[model samples]
Target: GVPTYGAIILDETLENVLLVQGYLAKSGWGFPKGKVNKEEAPHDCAAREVFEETGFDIKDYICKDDYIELRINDQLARLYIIPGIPKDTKFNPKTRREIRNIEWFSIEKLPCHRNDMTPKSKLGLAPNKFFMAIPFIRPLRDWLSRRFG
Candidate 1:
């Protein structure tokens, strides 16, 4: 699993975060991101992948010390915390084949984890649309609280 890079882009109010929907395996909504390219810096990869997915360049706004990295199942994924992007900014993906839609979602409303099917006596978390983005929600909220408040 090669390292993946992208940004958790936030609006000026910080109430919403940007997400992109991809085709097939990555059909669910998640932060705009992709795998790092050869010889590319991690930050550069974040900006490149984000721009390709959401059409909003994050390179100039990216901060070296501001990022969240998670390793799940041996694959490492890193997302730079980029705040203050205007909600009015126009976004158009580089390729429609890879991405289906890009939209902003309410942070407070987004589930940090999936629910359990207690009625069915399920022992594990139920399948969720935000599975790819779930692991980072709590972390992002904590990060914002610590850094901004």
Candidate 2:
């Protein structure tokens, strides 16, 4: 699968992060990102996808080295860390057909991982609305601690 690129946009307070809700299979709260286009550099792709999904350009803020890369099911996704954006900044997706909503969520309130279905005696993780974003929560928290603490 082609690599994906985008950003984890945070507000000036650094306590909130932006997430977009999508339709169908992607129907969940997740960071703004998309697959890389042919001949596109990673940073360029990140900015384009972010702008398309949230109507906010991140090109001016993306740091080449500040990103978290995760490979799941053989697909690589890299989300650049873009902090200090004002929370009140207007965000209107390029198309509502692909994005249902855009909102800010408190990082401390998001789940870093899904819970097990122990109460039901199930052997797998419980269904979570943040499944797509779960994998990066812990890493993002650690990154913040190392960079800001």
Candidate 3:
């Protein structure tokens, strides 16, 4: 069976977006997602993983019935669109044995090319780790750009 993971949109708001790079970004960067535990719903797992990795135990979020049907080459990912998180809340991701970094990024600040090396590389994050999320983040960015641009 193809592996299924849980990730989050952290659309914390319209303009400000939350993106996280894990220790595993040495391979590439994706959102805060991980394997689901036994008997855990995908969205619940997505939330748990986000909080575990990012430190916001948000209880309020929406799980679409069909809108975000995300499937990339048989690898299924369930994305939850979260809104209204305290924008003023300082961001501090959960620290573990591995290198983890979480920060609010401007939707318009992405690189010109997916392969462009990110400044996060110096912080030990993987180079060009943002590609995997381009297919995912594009629409969100466009929506927010129009909403608050």
Predicted structure with the largest TM-score when compared to the true one:
2
Q: Taking the tens digit of each residue's C-alpha lDDT, what string does model 1 give over 6-78?
A: 9999999999999888989998999987899889999999999998988888888999999999999999999
Model 2 / residue 29 / CA error / Å? 0.5
- Would you estimate the TM-scores of all the predictions? 0.97, 0.98, 0.68
lDDT of 3 by residue, 33-141 (tens): 6667888877677767777767776546554542233677877766666656666765566675442667666666754245523554543433465775666676665
Error (Å) of candidate 3 at residue 35 is 1.6
| Top candidate by lDDT | 2
lDDT (0-100) at residue 118 of candidate 1? 96
- Note each model's CA RMSD in angstroms: 0.8, 0.6, 6.1
Residue 41, model 1: Cα distance from true site in angstroms: 0.6
> What is candidate 1's CA lDDT for residue 41?
97
Question: Which residue pairs show collisions in model 1?
Answer: none
Candidate 2 segments whose C-alpha is farther than 4 A from its true place: none
Model 1 misplacement above 4 A: none
Clash count, predicted structure 2: 0
Candidate number that wins on lDDT, 2 or 3: 2
